[PDB]
């Protein structure tokens, strides 16, 4: 039978398109926001399949929005409620509005002034579309709105990230049609320099030194893909699945054991990212975005161009999401699946055996790249031979500039001339529904223990472990503790490896700074999730986003603080781990005009889940 | 004119022994424990060579050991001095002495009898050749000792590993030839089960699921070797060299931009590294490894097999040693050279230009590995297209193990049946003797601050940095602040870019925990590099090990500590940045039979060392 975790196809999104028109749900005037299929529930697969879909419905005319839910498999609407944003949130954040902040600030009176003022020519100002939050704009409260900034292009080739317009900012209702605020501090110079990192001026003349890398699988790759989306590849199972807001997201990560196939991950993924800014200007002191639960992540990916974007032996997938219309769009190429070599897995030389053994490793690597704006981010999941899993996020693209203040400043750094990059993070939240060989799981926090020298300890050179288990939601919001070591274990209480030990893994993060804003601000209250290192849920389906459903212009307090509270057990339970990491951002100007990559991620190991090193069949290369 | 870093040759070995012979210091009684090239004094290379070469050599008669440096250009004795050892240090282990613990005990009434209680035969039981450090044993002082710790092999291809034999450890005198010491504290079970990872009924059918993974260079690789050892790589430069104590070191890391060659490290090696124990059992509680300065590890260096342990199109250096009397011996291939792809360097799709730009990066990869009893090392330098510099060491071989107690431990993990492995930690020191744009250099501390909502920052959402200038070598002894985003800036304070600021390099620690022993143990006086992050010291010729000349039972406080305390100007001069990083290993089932890698390291990004992206030339793949 087919299965429940397969990825939507251009017929489910037809027929759901279909039943939303039957139903009087969909008519002319309304876009969909958020269109995707939903998770089977647990313990479904008893032969009684049951796809739903979920969509995010907006008006055009001023309607209230929609959420609704529908089987496509019995062509039902499950349930249908109108939103009220000023409480829930608005809705994301739609592709069609990316255009319509320039286009209405194009024709304002105040605008026009403020670009009079700095001779420039309204045809060549590019007007971002930026999320608004919550601040002090009570006619803000229920109303869809963004607020521009401007950069301007000295012709359409040119890189508008060269030459922001600081000083200036624009507030518009995105509904109504109308601007509700121009703001114009001050002119500060437009920088001059341009930063089109294609024109030979800029680049000088192209290296001529790189030989060839060539990387070929002469009898193909090692993994197989069935079902369309299912993996298997040295002794790892999973489902690779697609969401227009998440990106790739990875179900029944799975490992064969002799004959039993283990669960260890129910479903991994990016469940919210977010860039809060640093710079107290008021023309920029409001932003802070949040590329997955506002823009949708997956809905930017990249079609990824072999030999460019992926090297090697690739098999791609093509997802499909629905347009603003509920027509299904393919996005070719849009996820990477290959096998990497990965250097050496294990080695030793023995004199006394007189053997010398060498063994290499590999990962299996699922990605896919977006760009939302000035930004591309690749997501990246590594499973390896040894157990192992690692996510990591590669930054990219260009940074989002200001002016450089005359005489400096604490919160902006400079790139070029007249030229500045205010201060910001970006943070990711990776939402683990753990299933450590099955659902009965816990968590541990481990920390190192340092001994004192003495009675027992007389040499001083002791050294221990504790581990305290979170037994309830009220105690499972965990920080950091580098200097200690400090790491959270998922075990399974009642299955034990053969030396009598609860079966494990171990959580290691990076051990970056978290949200930095001031835990007074909006941005702390809607982004509460970035204040923490570690989170631990109970399961439950509606409980997907640490930010809740609709961030965009939500007031604050959505999602994990509101969850937790609910103190339920998580000792020996169906659990879920939110871990927060981050990259603190204090640009360079190697960052400029377009970044070289960097990276953060976290990784989990097998913690006594094997019997012995899980890699011993692997031959010699 | 012959660059006076290439690397040592034959003849020059060969010379060195000659010299030594006509200078009437190397007999048939002496051996050569240490023996290697030195670097150019600064200021050299005005048309006037001295290679000198120093020496440490043992003598197996009684008498004192030497110190000696020779002019293998001139053909002289530039020094020789007796070393008393009770003050200054032992040499370091022999290799000849790996053997003689065991035989030496083999005849010992005592050793016999342990062995004979449990069941055991001498001829079977293998003798570990364990440093032996400094303890409560008066007679020790001046006398280098050896301590032994037994594993029995039940036929000669068996890993001994499996089968510790605890509660007994012996103490010899390696130059008298006596068992100072037999303690045999009580019989634990000899761990029944075996380790034997090339065992078909330990591994199970091996796995007929990898398909090949062919990675060529069709045109060569991109980088050249001239000199022996000078490589030039897509801007960079540098020389490789190779010490038997250190193993690799790299010389005159540099980057071409444009037309001028900028310094930016001008000596980058592992200077120590150490294991320290954490089973406070009296059988080894004095147990901490030294593989550097105790062993030599370069000496202990692979033959790198091609497609096994190098993949790809590898140049090979194959580097000469001395042997115990003089005569040179080569490494065969124990350094590979290579370039690898590394994923996407760069990459933006702009909606508003239209311009899709993606470029993939790669590094140039120097790299050696070592094997020291159990454990085997890998050691890697990476240099990245962007001006990134990293280290990243690879730890796996067997673990160090023990008896599991009866009834468990609170210091030592279980890994088999009666098996256990006790927890213990591996530290490095890298030190990195900087030249940032040349040798004016000081060194900032750089953390992130938060700040408090309120006036000027009304939203609550700045934050903001602050450099500390660490102006003497009394300032200069750090600890990591994970949670502050802590690193180190390395600049050149009279070398600006062309936005006027000084030109610098960023040094981003992984965090992990520093030694854990207590500060009064003699690890902590004997390591005390390991007890902080990161040491910053005036260049001086002489200062080349954290811990001294000669750790082998040196009684503690030599190296750092002595040499900080100088308290010498650090604030734009001639400066070594040392860093500690080290791994804590709790074992774990999975690391047994045989440990997969598991890594540790540190890398330094350029920080406006560059006027822009270094990397605009790169072109399209
Ligand atoms: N990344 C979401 C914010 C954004 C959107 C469009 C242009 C610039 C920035
Ligand atoms: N690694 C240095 C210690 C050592 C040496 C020989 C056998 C086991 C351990
Ligand atoms: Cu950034
Ligand atoms: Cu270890
Ligand atoms: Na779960
Ligand atoms: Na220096």
């Not at 997956?298 to 090697?312: I, K, M, V």
């Amino acid at each position: 039978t087919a299965s429940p975790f397969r990825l939507a196809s251009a017929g489910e999104i037809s027929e759901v398109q279909g039943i939303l028109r039957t139903a009087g749900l969909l008519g002319p005037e309304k876009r969909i926001a958020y269109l995707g299929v939903l998770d089977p529930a647990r313990g479904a697969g008893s032969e009684a399949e049951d796809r739903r879909f979920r969509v995010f419905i907006h008006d055009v005319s001023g309607a209230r929005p929609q959420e609704v839910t529908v089987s496509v498999t019995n062509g039902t609407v499950i349930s249908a409620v109108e939103l009220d944003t000023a409480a829930t949130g608005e809705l994301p954040v739609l592709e069609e509005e990316f255009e319509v902040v320039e286009q209405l600030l194009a024709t304002d009176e105040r605008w026009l002034k403020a670009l009079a003022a700095r001779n420039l020519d309204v045809s060549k100002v590019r007007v971002a579309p930026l999320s608004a939050g919550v601040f002090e704009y009570a006619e803000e409260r229920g109303r869809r709105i963004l607020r521009g900034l401007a950069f301007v292009q000295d012709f359409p080739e040119d890189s508008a990230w060269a030459h922001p317009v600081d000083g200036l900012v624009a507030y518009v209702d995105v509904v109504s049609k109308e601007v509700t605020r121009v703001i114009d501090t001050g002119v500060f110079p437009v920088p001059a320099e341009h930063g089109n990192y294609t024109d030979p001026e800029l680049t000088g003349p192209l290296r001529t030194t790189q030989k060839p890398i060539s990387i070929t699988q002469p009898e193909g790759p090692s993994f197989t893909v069935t079902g369309g989306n299912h993996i298997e590849w040295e002794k790892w199972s999973l489902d690779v699945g697609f969401d227009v807001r998440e990106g790739v997201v990875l179900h029944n990560i799975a490992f064969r054991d002799g004959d039993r196939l283990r669960p260890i991950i129910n479903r991994a993924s990016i469940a919210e990212m977010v860039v809060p800014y640093g710079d107290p200007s008021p023309i920029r002191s409001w932003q802070n975005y949040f590329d997955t639960g506002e823009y949708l992540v997956g809905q930017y990916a990249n079609s990824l161009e072999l030999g460019c974007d992926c090297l090697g032996d690739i098999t791609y997938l093509s997802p499909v999401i629905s347009d603003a219309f509920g027509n299904p769009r393919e996005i070719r190429n849009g996820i990477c699946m290959h096998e990497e070599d990965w250097g050496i897995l294990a080695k030793h030389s023995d004199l006394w055996s007189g053997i010398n053994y060498t063994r290499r490793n590999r990962r299996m690597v699922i990605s896919f790249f977006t760009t939302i704006g000035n930004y591309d981010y690749g997501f990246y999941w590594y499973l390896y031979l040894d157990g192992t899993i690692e996510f990591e996020a590669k930054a990219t693209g260009v940074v989002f500039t200001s002016a450089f203040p005359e005489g400096g400043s604490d919160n902006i750094s400079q790139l070029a001339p007249g030229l500045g990059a205010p201060f910001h993070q970006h943070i990711f939240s990776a939402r683990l529904d753990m299933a450590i060989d099955g659902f009965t799981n816990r968590v541990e926090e481990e920390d190192v223990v340092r001994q004192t020298m003495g009675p027992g300890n007389e040499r001083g050179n002791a050294f221990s472990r504790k581990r305290t288990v979170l037994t309830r939601e009220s105690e499972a919001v965990r920080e950091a503790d580098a200097r200690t070591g400090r790491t959270w274990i998922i075990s399974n209480p009642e299955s034990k490896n053969r030396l009598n030990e609860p079966v494990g893994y171990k959580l290691h993060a990076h051990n970056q700074p978290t949200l930095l804003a001031d835990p007074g601000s909006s941005i702390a209250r809607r982004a509460a999730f970035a204040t923490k290192d570690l989170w631990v849920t109970r399961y439950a389906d509606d409980e997907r986003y640490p930010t809740g459903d609709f961030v965009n212009q939500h007031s604050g307090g959505a999602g994990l603080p509101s969850y937790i509270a609910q103190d339920r057990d998580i000792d020996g339970q169906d659990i879920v781990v939110w871990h927060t990491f981050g990259l603190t951002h204090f640009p360079r100007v190697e960052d400029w005009p377009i970044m070289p990559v960097d990276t953060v991620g976290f990784k989990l190991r097998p913690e006594g889940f094997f019997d012995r090193s899980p890699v011993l069949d692997v031959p010699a290369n």
